[PDB]
Amino acid sequence: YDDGTINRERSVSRLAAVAVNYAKAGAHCVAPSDMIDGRIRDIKRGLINANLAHKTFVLSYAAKFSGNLYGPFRDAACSAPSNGDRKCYQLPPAGRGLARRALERDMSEGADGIIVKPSTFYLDIMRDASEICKDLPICAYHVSGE
Amino acid sequence: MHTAEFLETEPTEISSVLAGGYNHPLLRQWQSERQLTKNMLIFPLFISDNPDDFTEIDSLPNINRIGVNRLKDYLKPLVAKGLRSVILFGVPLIPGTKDPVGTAADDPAGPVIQGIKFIREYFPELYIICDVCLCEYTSHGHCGVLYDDGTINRERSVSRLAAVAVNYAKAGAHCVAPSDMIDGRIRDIKRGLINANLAHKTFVLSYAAKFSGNLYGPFRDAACSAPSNGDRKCYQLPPAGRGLARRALERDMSEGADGIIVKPSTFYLDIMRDASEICKDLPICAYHVSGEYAMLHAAAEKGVVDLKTIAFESHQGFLRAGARLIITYLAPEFLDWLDE
Amino acid sequence: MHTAEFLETEPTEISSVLAGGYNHPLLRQWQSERQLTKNMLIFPLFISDNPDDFTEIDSLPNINRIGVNRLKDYLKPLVAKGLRSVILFGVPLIPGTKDPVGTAADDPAGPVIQGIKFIREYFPELYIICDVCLCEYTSHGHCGVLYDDGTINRERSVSRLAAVAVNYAKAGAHCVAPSDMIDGRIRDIKRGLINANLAHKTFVLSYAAKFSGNLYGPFRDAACSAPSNGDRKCYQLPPAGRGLARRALERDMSEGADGIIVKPSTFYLDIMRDASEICKDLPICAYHVSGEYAMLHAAAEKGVVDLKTIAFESHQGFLRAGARLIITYLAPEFLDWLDE
Amino acid sequence: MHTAEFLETEPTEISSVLAGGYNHPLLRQWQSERQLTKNMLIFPLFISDNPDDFTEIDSLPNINRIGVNRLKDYLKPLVAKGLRSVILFGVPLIPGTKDPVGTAADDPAGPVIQGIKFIREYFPELYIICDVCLCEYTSHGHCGVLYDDGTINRERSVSRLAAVAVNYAKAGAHCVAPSDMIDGRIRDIKRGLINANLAHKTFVLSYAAKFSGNLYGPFRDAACSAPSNGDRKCYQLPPAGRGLARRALERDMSEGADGIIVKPSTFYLDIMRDASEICKDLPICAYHVSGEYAMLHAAAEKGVVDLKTIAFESHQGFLRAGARLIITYLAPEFLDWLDE
Ligand SMILES: *[C@H](CCC(=O)O)CC[C@H](*)CCC(=O)O
Ligand SMILES: *[C@H](CCC(=O)O)CC[C@H](*)CCC(=O)O
Ligand SMILES: *[C@H](CCC(=O)O)CC[C@H](*)CCC(=O)O
Ligand SMILES: *[C@H](CCC(=O)O)CC[C@H](*)CCC(=O)O
Ligand SMILES: [Zn+2]
Ligand SMILES: [Zn+2]
Ligand SMILES: [Zn+2]
């Protein structure tokens, strides 16, 4: 938005296109790492409309936490925010209840698998995920900081 | 021209929308199942049998071997800043003291019982926890009494351990924390306290889920307790052993534990979560071990993380995972930090 | 003309769409709750009291009666290929050896204890499991000691069984697996190991859910253990007995089992699933029995199935159902197969 | 002398004692969660478009391709013996009939709809189930309509499938059983029946948990439906896919299934158990597939098992695992067997 806050609808519209476009290019799996509300639904609908949903694994970063452990990644992918931080979309580290809800949401919206990130420092969320998302593959992201 | 494609999407579902819950720093606080307070912190002390000792270990700030004449200067400002509890470890450095059955463990002239009397005298409001084990006191460095083949003698070990724990309580410890991981030791320590008319006064804080691993290096240097031959893999739990941890938690609660410790902490947060279910009616305590503590210092010096920042992240993680208490070498820092 | 009718349908619901999860062979691997590794495999050995024995049974490749001087040539390439564990069954063929109380079961000159010493000597890294029962050693062929009326004497049986199991452990077995299904035998074997100062060294792997049925034919031929009069229906569980299986699982865990075996396997996969809940904190082991093994060979020769293919399908099914270990006569094949 | 050692043991614990529950053959019946009755049995029929056909397949007794003028002689004694239900599969052998969209699937002159009318006329008490899929009717042998790249076209497939299922119901089938495993097909078939004013008359029995594997050989020979290019691994579930099975079960129930089929049976008994929880309010049906059926025959000819005996063991296992219905090629045998 002009105020520097995230535009949900515009964002998920853009994100869904990028994900379809990668699949169209030949990616087997898309892993949305944006943490923007409802993006998995729009990406799944996008793949369905593209006749690609039966070919494309959606691996959501459903439980993705804000924190101090992404330093080196940011250096390698040169993606640091210019103004401010990710605290209003990445989950707050103490936010267990929000993680649990984000896990239920992303599975409900079409995720075939889920990523918990960071890993070691969020092992309890992995355990929470292993219950909520028991019928789905869970993937741990050992982040650059870890 | 490659241009920015935007897909046509449907109206927002209310079920998708989480953002209203954490858009402001006060809400990110509100989202915690429990807040970090000063009285949750337990600080380990290593007492030397040299009363004038103040030896720094591995260049870490909050791991020193301290003798009793040095304890009052050291604790005064800590207690000043709201420190509520300590966990004592003994380091008898005098030669000929260690033997195969850990005789010095409950030596009334030993640093643990000397420290207990010092602290009950000079800091009567401090809550005293003593570690209960034999590894700091056996010549072989193992947590129990051994068979001739070097394996652990269960019955002989728990018999010895139960005496040490009663003897600390008799000396004035408020809490005993058996760290030996020897099968059934909590039952024998509880029965021991009951027979001593001390069970109604003594909190038993079991190290119920205590894992073998690579994270105890610095501790071993400070308490000089490394095993002499082999390792702890047949009594400390194997890191992949979730099922064994769950059973050890049910066991220790059944045998009388008033509280449980999960150790190490960060690397075993999922066991904390498992403990928060099995042991839901008991206090859970996280032990931020010396390896975890020095790992954060190492990372912060190399510029990978910010020490205060990752310290808060790690310690909030304990609370997120179910712990309501924390043993940590960073207690002096948090007694300042939680002020601001 | 009859033409192809197509109904008008609504847009796809996201909830309907599962296909994104298994459209590629790596994903069909990802979908497994656990993968098949070499160290999960346990291979049965039938040791003969004739030290030069190498007798093939029922024309099956991986059921031979083998004497001790023949064991090293036989195990060497198996261990070569990563075999980690064996389960010993004794077959005393010398006349006058069998009697009504199974005296030869723990004969130090018997093939089980001879095999244990051979293997601890020549293959010190192999994990040794011994079957614990009397059927291979009684003249009447029953798993326990009998009353004069031919029915099982519980107390006399478990007393005998507990000694055999301690005696195998004393000889060097790492694990005992009581297959007798006689009420309360695990309690008595555990107490026996405890009294022998061996319980901290010996894994008790109970055949807790062991069913009577039609699938043990070939085994009986190889271990020569068929009952002489009647059958096992009053101690082995009745195939329809789900409630009794569930109770036998709770019982054996309560009495000290460190692990449990469900047997047979394929035909009792639902009991494996039941076990994975009741015994969630313990290793579950599937026994692919001789009847199940020869059934697959029979089917594959008649062209109904592909042996390697249905072998992988059946053994993945064990893991799907909750097992993390497998006793199987197809272990030599999987030690090659899991390479490719 | 080696003598028979007996350990000293404690008095029997009541908790150990299970034997009082199954010491008599009537009690071993009592222990079943449900008994095997005739009306639980569903027998598959393969109808040929040659009305005088009676072709035996793979030398198995209860897999024949039968034409309609031969059906009354064949069903009469079966129905005589209490057969309550049949599941129809069509085998159009006339050339030029198969095409890429399965047009002949609902051909009113086709063997399924001819068989439905024959049976409603001549056996008005028989409960008729028809398999709903396109594999027996497509030139390419796949269960759905394909994209030019040979992959399944979901929307086109479920549109076609829903019509076939309505058309069978319109013809007089009491039940449709979609075996296609194509995402969301049950929703579209249910909506189709609703729009046809037939949903209150038609049981939808989904093959919800239907696995890819090695056990469909003989069926493929009898219904001549083998895929021409490749296999069914991207729509049939992968054998290790427990999580996908559980989700497919929840999905199909949510989309309108009145009952569910788990297939194959013996090799997927744990999924039956999973289904008995998820789908506890619905009938569960086990499909003893042609591969499983011929495997038992193969084993019984080689002398590994007794056919009647392992047949009862396997079919009781279905019921033990949660099934209250069974599709089985052994129905003619059980209609005699359950008499004695
Ligand atoms: C998530 C966003 C990361 C971030 O920089 O906020 C996608 C990549 C995560 C890996 C991070 C790492 O390896 O540190
Ligand atoms: C448990 C035994 C530790 C060991 O060295 O095995 C009691 C003390 C644990 C704290 C260890 C640490 O701070 O690293
Ligand atoms: C259990 C008793 C078997 C029996 O013959 O009753 C111990 C061995 C089981 C393996 C049986 C097999 O492989 O068929
Ligand atoms: C499901 C599809 C079977 C297949 O050939 O893929 C419908 C019929 C199942 C019965 C198969 C059998 O009896 O082997
Ligand atoms: Zn210790
Ligand atoms: Zn036996
Ligand atoms: Zn089909």
Side-chain angles (χ1 to χ4, degrees):
Chain A
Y1 283 124
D2 310 309
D3 66 359
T5 71
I6 293 248
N7 187 335
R8 196 204 80 80
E9 102 162 286
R10 209 75 187 126
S11 293
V12 301
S13 171
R14 188 63 203 114
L15 284 171
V18 172
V20 169
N21 285 332
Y22 290 162
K24 279 167 160 184
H28 302 94
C29 171
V30 292
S33 66
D34 56 287
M35 283 303 300
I36 296 162
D37 284 336
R39 93 270 213 200
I40 305 306
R41 189 200 57 162
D42 300 324
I43 290 157
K44 196 81 169 174
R45 175 59 54 194
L47 292 170
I48 285 165
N49 286 333
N51 296 135
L52 292 177
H54 62 114
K55 310 211 281 151
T56 316
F57 190 104
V58 178
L59 176 70
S60 178
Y61 306 63
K64 187 177 175 123
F65 290 86
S66 92
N68 199 218
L69 289 160
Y70 305 140
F73 178 84
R74 262 153 208 201
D75 291 339
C78 311
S79 41
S82 295
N83 286 28
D85 59 54
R86 312 214 192 299
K87 293 194 191 159
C88 297
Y89 38 112
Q90 276 171 5
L91 310 174
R96 180 189 179 211
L98 289 160
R100 292 176 46 97
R101 285 171 66 207
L103 287 165
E104 276 135 359
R105 176 193 63 189
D106 287 7
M107 162 168 69
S108 167
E109 290 189 5
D112 301 290
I114 72 96
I115 297 168
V116 174
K117 159 179 175 175
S119 49
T120 294
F121 284 76
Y122 296 92
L123 287 163
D124 56 304
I125 304 291
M126 260 178 245
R127 168 60 43 212
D128 274 318
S130 77
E131 312 287 358
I132 294 154
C133 299
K134 56 168 133 307
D135 295 322
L136 315 179
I138 298 163
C139 174
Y141 201 136
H142 197 237
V143 302
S144 63
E146 289 175 323
Chain B
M1 269 323 281
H2 175 75
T3 53
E5 178 180 7
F6 289 84
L7 294 194
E8 203 94 71
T9 59
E10 317 161 60
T12 309
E13 335 229 17
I14 283 162
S15 62
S16 291
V17 173
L18 272 50
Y22 56 105
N23 51 75
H24 184 281
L26 181 67
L27 300 167
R28 296 196 289 267
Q29 290 182 6
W30 280 15
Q31 288 295 341
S32 71
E33 297 155 293
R34 112 215 317 121
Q35 326 232 26
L36 189 38
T37 55
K38 271 170 195 235
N39 66 14
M40 286 175 180
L41 304 162
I42 307 155
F43 190 43
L45 298 177
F46 303 84
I47 321 278
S48 165
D49 45 0
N50 175 3
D52 307 312
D53 254 27
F54 211 101
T55 306
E56 19 208 82
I57 314 295
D58 290 337
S59 316
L60 307 152
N62 306 328
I63 325 217
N64 274 243
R65 238 177 253 143
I66 306 168
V68 166
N69 309 330
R70 283 310 250 301
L71 266 210
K72 186 195 107 184
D73 277 354
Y74 186 68
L75 289 179
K76 196 147 173 62
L78 291 184
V79 164
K81 299 192 280 152
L83 179 73
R84 300 296 309 280
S85 166
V86 291
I87 180 161
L88 308 183
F89 301 86
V91 198
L93 291 173
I94 294 158
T97 297
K98 303 189 181 184
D99 73 15
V101 306
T103 301
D106 39 21
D107 179 11
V112 177
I113 286 144
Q114 280 303 286
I116 298 173
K117 322 223 125 139
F118 172 83
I119 292 157
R120 292 296 296 125
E121 196 166 312
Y122 290 93
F123 300 111
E125 292 269 25
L126 212 55
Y127 190 80
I128 310 165
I129 307 170
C130 309
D131 185 68
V132 172
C133 204
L134 306 174
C135 49
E136 286 147 57
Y137 304 95
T138 51
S139 41
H140 50 76
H142 283 282
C143 293
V145 177
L146 306 180
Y147 283 124
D148 310 309
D149 66 359
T151 71
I152 293 248
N153 187 335
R154 196 204 80 80
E155 102 162 286
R156 209 75 187 126
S157 293
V158 301
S159 171
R160 188 63 203 114
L161 284 171
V164 172
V166 169
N167 285 332
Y168 290 162
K170 279 167 160 184
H174 302 94
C175 171
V176 292
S179 66
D180 56 287
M181 283 303 300
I182 296 162
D183 284 336
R185 93 270 213 200
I186 305 306
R187 189 200 57 162
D188 300 324
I189 290 157
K190 196 81 169 174
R191 175 59 54 194
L193 292 170
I194 285 165
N195 286 333
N197 296 135
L198 292 177
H200 62 114
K201 310 211 281 151
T202 316
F203 190 104
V204 178
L205 176 70
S206 178
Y207 306 63
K210 187 177 175 123
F211 290 86
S212 92
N214 199 218
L215 289 160
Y216 305 140
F219 178 84
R220 262 153 208 201
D221 291 339
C224 311
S225 41
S228 295
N229 286 28
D231 59 54
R232 312 214 192 299
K233 293 194 191 159
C234 297
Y235 38 112
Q236 276 171 5
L237 310 174
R242 180 189 179 211
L244 289 160
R246 292 176 46 97
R247 285 171 66 207
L249 287 165
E250 276 135 359
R251 176 193 63 189
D252 287 7
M253 162 168 69
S254 167
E255 290 189 5
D258 301 290
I260 72 96
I261 297 168
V262 174
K263 159 179 175 175
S265 49
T266 294
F267 284 76
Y268 296 92
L269 287 163
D270 56 304
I271 304 291
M272 260 178 245
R273 168 60 43 212
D274 274 318
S276 77
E277 312 287 358
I278 294 154
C279 299
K280 56 168 133 307
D281 295 322
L282 315 179
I284 298 163
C285 174
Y287 201 136
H288 197 237
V289 302
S290 63
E292 289 175 323
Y293 170 68
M295 180 193 277
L296 299 184
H297 274 288
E301 313 204 347
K302 197 123 171 269
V304 183
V305 292
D306 177 67
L307 182 71
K308 185 180 164 166
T309 298
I310 199 57
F312 266 92
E313 187 165 348
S314 68
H315 283 46
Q316 281 162 11
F318 308 149
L319 312 190
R320 189 187 55 246
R324 87 177 78 161
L325 306 166
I326 310 170
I327 305 167
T328 178
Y329 300 103
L330 285 155
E333 281 90 358
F334 280 97
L335 289 176
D336 283 332
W337 288 343
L338 294 160
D339 276 325
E340 339 171 315
Chain C
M1 269 323 281
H2 175 75
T3 53
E5 178 180 7
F6 289 84
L7 294 194
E8 203 94 71
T9 59
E10 317 161 60
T12 309
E13 335 229 17
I14 283 162
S15 62
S16 291
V17 173
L18 272 50
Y22 56 105
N23 51 75
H24 184 281
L26 181 67
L27 300 167
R28 296 196 289 267
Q29 290 182 6
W30 280 15
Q31 288 295 341
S32 71
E33 297 155 293
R34 112 215 317 121
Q35 326 232 26
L36 189 38
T37 55
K38 271 170 195 235
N39 66 14
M40 286 175 180
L41 304 162
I42 307 155
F43 190 43
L45 298 177
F46 303 84
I47 321 278
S48 165
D49 45 0
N50 175 3
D52 307 312
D53 254 27
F54 211 101
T55 306
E56 19 208 82
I57 314 295
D58 290 337
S59 316
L60 307 152
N62 306 328
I63 325 217
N64 274 243
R65 238 177 253 143
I66 306 168
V68 166
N69 309 330
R70 283 310 250 301
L71 266 210
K72 186 195 107 184
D73 277 354
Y74 186 68
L75 289 179
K76 196 147 173 62
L78 291 184
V79 164
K81 299 192 280 152
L83 179 73
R84 300 296 309 280
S85 166
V86 291
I87 180 161
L88 308 183
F89 301 86
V91 198
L93 291 173
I94 294 158
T97 297
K98 303 189 181 184
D99 73 15
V101 306
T103 301
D106 39 21
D107 179 11
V112 177
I113 286 144
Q114 280 303 286
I116 298 173
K117 322 223 125 139
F118 172 83
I119 292 157
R120 292 296 296 125
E121 196 166 312
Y122 290 93
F123 300 111
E125 292 269 25
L126 212 55
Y127 190 80
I128 310 165
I129 307 170
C130 309
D131 185 68
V132 172
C133 204
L134 306 174
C135 49
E136 286 147 57
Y137 304 95
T138 51
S139 41
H140 50 76
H142 283 282
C143 293
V145 177
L146 306 180
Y147 283 124
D148 310 309
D149 66 359
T151 71
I152 293 248
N153 187 335
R154 196 204 80 80
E155 102 162 286
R156 209 75 187 126
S157 293
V158 301
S159 171
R160 188 63 203 114
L161 284 171
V164 172
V166 169
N167 285 332
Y168 290 162
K170 279 167 160 184
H174 302 94
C175 171
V176 292
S179 66
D180 56 287
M181 283 303 300
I182 296 162
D183 284 336
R185 93 270 213 200
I186 305 306
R187 189 200 57 162
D188 300 324
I189 290 157
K190 196 81 169 174
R191 175 59 54 194
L193 292 170
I194 285 165
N195 286 333
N197 296 135
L198 292 177
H200 62 114
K201 310 211 281 151
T202 316
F203 190 104
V204 178
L205 176 70
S206 178
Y207 306 63
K210 187 177 175 123
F211 290 86
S212 92
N214 199 218
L215 289 160
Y216 305 140
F219 178 84
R220 262 153 208 201
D221 291 339
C224 311
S225 41
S228 295
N229 286 28
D231 59 54
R232 312 214 192 299
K233 293 194 191 159
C234 297
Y235 38 112
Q236 276 171 5
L237 310 174
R242 180 189 179 211
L244 289 160
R246 292 176 46 97
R247 285 171 66 207
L249 287 165
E250 276 135 359
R251 176 193 63 189
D252 287 7
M253 162 168 69
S254 167
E255 290 189 5
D258 301 290
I260 72 96
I261 297 168
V262 174
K263 159 179 175 175
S265 49
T266 294
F267 284 76
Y268 296 92
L269 287 163
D270 56 304
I271 304 291
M272 260 178 245
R273 168 60 43 212
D274 274 318
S276 77
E277 312 287 358
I278 294 154
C279 299
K280 56 168 133 307
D281 295 322
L282 315 179
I284 298 163
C285 174
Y287 201 136
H288 197 237
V289 302
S290 63
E292 289 175 323
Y293 170 68
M295 180 193 277
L296 299 184
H297 274 288
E301 313 204 347
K302 197 123 171 269
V304 183
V305 292
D306 177 67
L307 182 71
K308 185 180 164 166
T309 298
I310 199 57
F312 266 92
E313 187 165 348
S314 68
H315 283 46
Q316 281 162 11
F318 308 149
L319 312 190
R320 189 187 55 246
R324 87 177 78 161
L325 306 166
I326 310 170
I327 305 167
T328 178
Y329 300 103
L330 285 155
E333 281 90 358
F334 280 97
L335 289 176
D336 283 332
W337 288 343
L338 294 160
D339 276 325
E340 339 171 315
Chain D
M1 269 323 281
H2 175 75
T3 53
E5 178 180 7
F6 288 84
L7 294 194
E8 203 94 71
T9 59
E10 317 161 60
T12 309
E13 335 229 17
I14 283 162
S15 62
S16 291
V17 173
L18 272 50
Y22 56 105
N23 51 75
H24 184 281
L26 181 67
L27 300 167
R28 296 196 289 267
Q29 290 182 6
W30 280 15
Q31 288 295 341
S32 71
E33 297 155 293
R34 112 215 317 121
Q35 326 232 26
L36 189 38
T37 55
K38 271 170 195 235
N39 66 14
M40 286 175 180
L41 304 162
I42 307 155
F43 190 43
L45 298 177
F46 303 84
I47 321 278
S48 165
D49 45 0
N50 175 3
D52 307 312
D53 254 27
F54 211 101
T55 306
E56 19 208 82
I57 314 295
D58 290 337
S59 316
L60 307 152
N62 306 328
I63 325 217
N64 274 243
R65 238 177 253 143
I66 306 168
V68 166
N69 309 330
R70 283 310 250 301
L71 266 210
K72 186 195 107 184
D73 277 354
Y74 186 68
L75 289 179
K76 196 147 173 62
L78 291 184
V79 164
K81 299 192 280 152
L83 179 73
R84 300 296 309 280
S85 166
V86 291
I87 180 161
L88 308 183
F89 301 86
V91 198
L93 291 173
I94 294 158
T97 297
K98 303 189 181 184
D99 73 15
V101 306
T103 301
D106 39 21
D107 179 11
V112 177
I113 286 144
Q114 280 303 286
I116 298 173
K117 322 223 125 139
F118 172 83
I119 292 157
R120 292 296 296 125
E121 196 166 312
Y122 290 93
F123 300 111
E125 292 269 25
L126 212 55
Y127 190 80
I128 310 165
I129 307 170
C130 309
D131 185 68
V132 172
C133 204
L134 306 174
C135 49
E136 286 147 57
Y137 304 95
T138 51
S139 41
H140 50 76
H142 283 282
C143 293
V145 177
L146 306 180
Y147 283 124
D148 310 309
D149 66 359
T151 71
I152 293 248
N153 187 335
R154 196 204 80 80
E155 102 162 286
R156 209 75 187 126
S157 293
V158 301
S159 171
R160 188 63 203 114
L161 284 171
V164 172
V166 169
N167 285 332
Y168 290 162
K170 279 167 160 184
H174 302 94
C175 171
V176 292
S179 66
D180 56 287
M181 283 303 300
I182 296 162
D183 284 336
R185 93 270 213 200
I186 305 306
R187 189 200 57 162
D188 300 324
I189 290 157
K190 196 81 169 174
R191 175 59 54 194
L193 292 170
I194 285 165
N195 286 333
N197 296 135
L198 292 177
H200 62 114
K201 310 211 281 151
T202 316
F203 190 104
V204 178
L205 176 70
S206 178
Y207 306 63
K210 187 177 175 123
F211 290 86
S212 92
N214 199 218
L215 289 160
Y216 305 140
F219 178 84
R220 262 153 208 201
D221 291 339
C224 311
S225 41
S228 295
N229 286 28
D231 59 54
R232 312 214 192 299
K233 293 194 191 159
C234 297
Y235 38 112
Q236 276 171 5
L237 310 174
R242 180 189 179 211
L244 289 160
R246 292 176 46 97
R247 285 171 66 207
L249 287 165
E250 276 135 359
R251 176 193 63 189
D252 287 7
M253 162 168 69
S254 167
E255 290 189 5
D258 301 290
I260 72 96
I261 297 168
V262 174
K263 159 179 175 175
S265 49
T266 294
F267 284 76
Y268 296 92
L269 287 163
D270 56 304
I271 304 291
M272 260 178 245
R273 168 60 43 212
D274 274 318
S276 77
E277 312 287 358
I278 294 154
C279 299
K280 56 168 133 307
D281 295 322
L282 315 179
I284 298 163
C285 174
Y287 201 136
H288 197 237
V289 302
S290 63
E292 289 175 323
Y293 170 68
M295 180 193 277
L296 299 184
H297 274 288
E301 313 204 347
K302 197 123 171 269
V304 183
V305 292
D306 177 67
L307 182 71
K308 185 180 164 166
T309 298
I310 199 57
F312 266 92
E313 187 165 348
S314 68
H315 283 46
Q316 281 162 11
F318 308 149
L319 312 190
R320 189 187 55 246
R324 87 177 78 161
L325 306 166
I326 310 170
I327 305 167
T328 178
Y329 300 103
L330 285 155
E333 281 90 358
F334 280 97
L335 289 176
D336 283 332
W337 288 343
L338 294 160
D339 276 325
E340 339 171 315

